[PDB]
Ligand SMILES: N[C@@H](Cc1c[nH]c2ccccc12)C(=O)O
Ligand SMILES: N[C@@H](Cc1c[nH]c2ccccc12)C(=O)O
Ligand SMILES: N[C@@H](Cc1c[nH]c2ccccc12)C(=O)O
Ligand SMILES: N[C@@H](Cc1c[nH]c2ccccc12)C(=O)O
Ligand SMILES: N[C@@H](Cc1c[nH]c2ccccc12)C(=O)O
Ligand SMILES: N[C@@H](Cc1c[nH]c2ccccc12)C(=O)O
Ligand SMILES: N[C@@H](Cc1c[nH]c2ccccc12)C(=O)O
Ligand SMILES: N[C@@H](Cc1c[nH]c2ccccc12)C(=O)O
Ligand SMILES: N[C@@H](Cc1c[nH]c2ccccc12)C(=O)O
C-alpha cells in the first residue's frame with residue numbers, strides 16, 4: 084500500500100488526513116517542526132492527504148514541494 | 152489503488168471527486184489555495200477526479216497542468 | 221484498475237462513458253471547458269470512454285490528442 | 289484488463305466488439321468521426337476488437353495503423 | 357489475459373481461433389481485408405490462434421509477419 | 425499463461441502438443457504451411473510443445489529457430 | 492509490506508510509530524543514538540512513522556534527511 | 561509456470577522430466593533430433609528437467625549449452 | 629515472501645535486535661555477530677522492526693547503508 | 698511457480714543434492730551429472746535448499762556462480 | 767520465496783538456519799567445503815540465515831562476502 088514522505092521546511096507544517104468513505108472531512112492533523120519527516124500511508128481511514136506549509140514531498144510519482 | 156498529486160498554483164483551486172457507480176455527480180469539492188498539495192486516491196466512492204483552476208498535477212502517466220478560466 | 225487523463229484544449233470538450241455490459245450506450249457525458257483536467261478510471265459501470273473535441277490525453281500507452 | 293486507444297484519422301471509422309464465448313459475432317459497432325478518440329477495454333462481453341477505416345491505434349504492444 | 361494484434365496487409369487474411377480443451381479444431385475464422393486490424397485475446401474458448409495470409413503481427417514477444 | 429509464436433519457414437511444419445499430467449504423449453499436431461503463424465499457449469491440456477520443421481520461434485526468452 | 496531505513500546522525504533521534512485506524516496517536520518512540528540503524532515496517536499497528544532528530548532516511552522513494560532540533 | 565526452451569544441435573538429445581514429490585525418478589524422456597525444438601514447462605508432475613546431448617537451451621536466467 | 633536485510637559485521641559484538649510485531653514494542657532477541665559474519669534476516673510474524681548496533685555494512689532493497697559503533 | 702537453478706556439469710560426477718523442506722533437514726536425493734549435462738531444478742514442496750558439489754556453471758536469478766571440485 | 771547463494775571460499779564454512787517463530791535459535795548448520803555452493807531458501811522453518819567463514823554470497827540485494 085502507497086505512502087508519501089513529507090519533510091517540513093519550516094515550523095508548523097500541517098499534514099492533514101481526509102476520511103475515506105462517502106463523506107469527506109479531515110480526521111487528523113499532524114504538525115511537523117522544521118526538519119522533521121513524516122512517512123504516511125494511505126489506509127482504511129485515510130484516502131487523501133493534504134499538506135499545508137513549506138514541505139518537500141516524495142511520492143511514487145516523484146518530488147513535489149508545498150509552499151505556505 | 153492509484154493516486155494523483157495536485158499542487159494548487161493560485162487560490163481557489165477545486166479538486167472534485169465524481170461518484171463511483173451508474174450515477175455520475177460531484178460528491179465533494181476540495182478547495183486548495185496557492186502552494187498547497189493534495190494527494191488523492193481513487194476509491195470505493197471516487198472513480199473520476201476533476202481539477203478546476205491552475206494546478207500542477209502528477210499521475211502515474213506523468214505531469215499535466217490544469218489552467219483556470 | 222487503469223485511468224485516463226484528459227485535458228481540454230478548448231471549451232465544450234465531452235468525456236463520454238460507455239456502459240459496461242451486453243448493452244453499449246452513453247450513460248454520462250462530462251463537459252470540460254478549456255484548461256480543465258479530468259482523470260477518469262475504467263469501472264464497474266464504464267468499460268469504454270470516448271473523447272469528442274480538442275483535448276490532450278494520457279494513458280498508460282502514451283500521449284494522444286483528440287481533434288474537434 | 290487491457291485496453292486499446294483508437295483515434296479516427298477520417299470520418300466513419302468503426303470500432304467493432306466481437307462477443308466473448310463459444311460464439312463469435314459482432315455485438316457493437318462504434319462509429320468515430322475524424323479526430324475522435326475511443327479508449328476501449330476487453331471485457332466480460334468483448335474478447336476481440338476489429339478496427340475498420342483509417343485510424344491510429346495504441347496497444348500495450350505499441351503503435352499500429354488501420355487503413356481505409 | 358494476453359492478446360495479439362493483426363493488421364491485414366492484403367485482402368482475405370484469416371485469423372482462426374483454435375479450441376481450448378482436449379479437443380483441437382478451428383471454431384472461428386475472422387476474415388480481414390487489407391488495412392483492417394484485429395486485436396484478439398486468448399480466452400476460455402480460444403487457446404491458440406493461427407493467421408493465414410499476408411499480415412503484420414504484434415505480440416508481447418515483438419513483431420512477426422505472416423506471408424500468404 | 426504464457427505462449428509461443430511459431431512462424432513456418434517452409435511447408436509441412438508440425439507444432440505438436442504434449443499432455444499435461446502424469447503421462448506424456450502427443451494429443452495434437454497442427455500443420456503449418458510456409459508463412460503461416462501459430463500463436464499457442466500452455467494450457468490445462470498442453471504443458472510442453474514440440475516444433476518439427478523449419479520455423480522462426482519467439483518466446484519470452486527470445487528468438488530461436490528450428491530446422 | 493514497505494519499510495523505511497533510519498540511520499541516526501546524532502544522539503537521541505526518535506523514530507515514532509503512529510497508530511493505524513480511526514484513532515491516531517503515538518504508540519511507541521524508539522530512541523537511536525548516533526550511528527545506529529533501525530529498519531522499520533508499516534504494520535497492522537503502525538500506518539505512519541515520524542522521525543525527529545538528525546537522521547539519514549531511505550525509503551522506496553529514495554533518500555531523505557531529517558534535520559534536528 | 562516457468563518453461564525452458566531446448567534446441568537439439570545433434571540427433572538423440574534427451575530431455576528428461578524428473579518426478580515432483582518426495583520421490584525423484586525420471587518419468588519421461590523426450591527424444592529430439594537435430595534442429596527440433598521443445599518448449600517445456602515445470603508442472604504438477606515435473607519439478608526438474610535434465611538435458612543430455614548437444615543442445616542450446618534458453619531459460620529465464622539466460623542461455624546455457626549442453627554438450628554430449 | 630517478506631523482505632529481508634543483509635547485515636555484515638565490520639567488528640566483533642554487533643547486535644542485530646528484532647523488535648516485536650503487534651500492539652506492543654520490545655526487543656525479543658539480539659543476535660550477536662562477530663567480525664566478518666553475515667546475517668540475512670527477514671521481517672516475519674514476530675519481527676516487524678530490526679535495530680542494528682555496532683559497525684556493520686547493511687543491504688536492503690533501498691540500497692546500502694552503514695551502522696557505526 | 699517457484700524459482701529454479703540451472704546447473705551445467707563442467708566435469709564428471711557432479712552431484713546436485715536436494716535438502717528436505719521442513720523441521721527436519723537432510724539430503725533426500727543426489728542427482729549425478731556427467732560432463733556437459735544440464736539440470737534445471739526447482740525449489741519444491743520437498744526441496745528448500747540445493748547443494749552443488751564438483752565443478753559446475755550455475756545460473757540463478759542472482760546471476761552466474763561457479764562451484765569448484 | 768527468496769533464496770541466498772553461498773559459495774565456500776575455504777573449508778568448513780558454516781551456513782546456519784535460525785528458527786522462524788517467537789523463539790530464535792539455530793536448528794541446522796550445513797557445512798560447506800571450498801568451492802561447494804549452497805542455494806538456500808527462506809522457509810516455514812528458517813527466517814534468518816547466518817554465514818560463518820570465508821564465503822561469496824549472492825542475494826537479491828547484490829553480492830556480499832563473509833570473512834572467516
Ligand atoms: N471521502 C473521499 C475522499 C477522497 C479521496 N479521493 C478524492 C478525490 C476527490 C475528492 C474527494 C476524495 C473518498 O474516499 O472517496
Ligand atoms: N460514475 C462513473 C464515473 C466515471 C468514471 N470514468 C468515467 C469515464 C467517463 C464518464 C464517467 C466516468 C463510473 O463509475 O463509471
Ligand atoms: N458494453 C461493451 C462496451 C465495450 C468495451 N470495449 C468495446 C470494444 C468494442 C465495442 C464495444 C466495447 C462491453 O462492456 O464489452
Ligand atoms: N468468441 C471468441 C472470440 C475470439 C477471441 N480471440 C479470438 C481469436 C480468433 C478467433 C476468435 C476469437 C472467444 O471468446 O474466444
Ligand atoms: N485444445 C488445445 C489447443 C492448443 C493450445 N496450445 C497448443 C500447442 C500445441 C497443440 C495444441 C495446442 C489446448 O487447449 O491445449
Ligand atoms: N506430461 C508431462 C509433460 C512435461 C512437461 N514438461 C516436461 C519436461 C520434461 C519431460 C516431460 C514434460 C507433465 O505435465 O509434467
Ligand atoms: N510493534 C510495532 C513495531 C514497529 C514497526 N514499525 C514501527 C515504526 C515505528 C515504531 C514502531 C514500529 C508494530 O508492529 O507496529
Ligand atoms: N490513524 C491514521 C494514521 C495515518 C496514516 N496516514 C495518515 C495521513 C494523515 C493523517 C493520519 C494518517 C490511519 O491509520 O489512517
Ligand atoms: N525467530 C525470529 C528470527 C528472526 C528473523 N529476523 C530477525 C531479526 C532480528 C532477530 C531475530 C530475527 C523470527 O522469526 O522473527
Ligand SMILES: N[C@@H](Cc1c[nH]c2ccccc12)C(=O)O
Pocket residue numbers: 578579580581582583584585607608713714715716726727728738739740741742743744747
Ligand atoms: N522429487 C524432487 C525433485 C527435485 C526438484 N528439485 C531438486 C533439487 C535437487 C534434488 C532433487 C530435486 C522434488 O520435487 O523436490
Ligand SMILES: N[C@@H](Cc1c[nH]c2ccccc12)C(=O)O
Pocket residue numbers: 716717718719720721722723745746781782783784794795796806807808809810811812815
Ligand atoms: N529443512 C530446512 C532446510 C533449509 C532451508 N534453508 C536453510 C538455511 C539454513 C539451514 C537450513 C535450511 C528448511 O526447510 O527450513
